[model samples]
Target: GSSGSSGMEEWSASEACLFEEALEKYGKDFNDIRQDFLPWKSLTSIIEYYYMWKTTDRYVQQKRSGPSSG
Candidate 1:
């Protein structure tokens, strides 16, 4: 029998925050985020987190708050 346990994994709050920070610094550069900011996390994980994070209030509030700097 083939193993089929492809369950979805969620990111921690701290990880989500780190992703936000990385996104701020690197824009959509997933490779950079993976290499520099989230070295422990796989690029696939970061990308998945990004799309999920987009649906959260945190992302909305951040966007509503405008640019990080003037």
Candidate 2:
């Protein structure tokens, strides 16, 4: 399973800064953040690493929290 992700996967200084700005303002969830700012990818390497970082953080947080829901 993948995002069917395409396009470059690198970041320049400005794009990197912009990505971080987005992350700060809208990083409660990866999917939401992605949806909200996908358009910026054209200028930000699609901020691909943002997805990876959020996914990893979610995994670790969930692992620590254990499992259960209603």
TM-score of each: 0.65, 0.36
Model 1 weakest lDDT span, ten residues long:
58-67
Candidate 2: minimum summed lDDT over ten consecutive residues — where?
A: 38-47
Per-residue accuracy of model 1 over 12-36 as CA lDDT, tens digit each: 8898899899888898999998997
- The C-alpha stretches of model 1 lying farther than 4 A from their native spots are 1-6, 57-70
What C-alpha lDDT values do all the predictions have?
Answer: 0.80, 0.57
Assess the local accuracy of residue 52 in candidate 1 as a C-alpha lDDT between 0 and 100: 73
Candidate with maximal lDDT: 1
lDDT of 2 by residue, 1-70 (tens): 5544467565567756656777688754555555665554543345456676556645454335536676
Q: Deviation in angstroms for 68 in model 2?
A: 49
Give the true-structure RMSD of model 2: 10.6
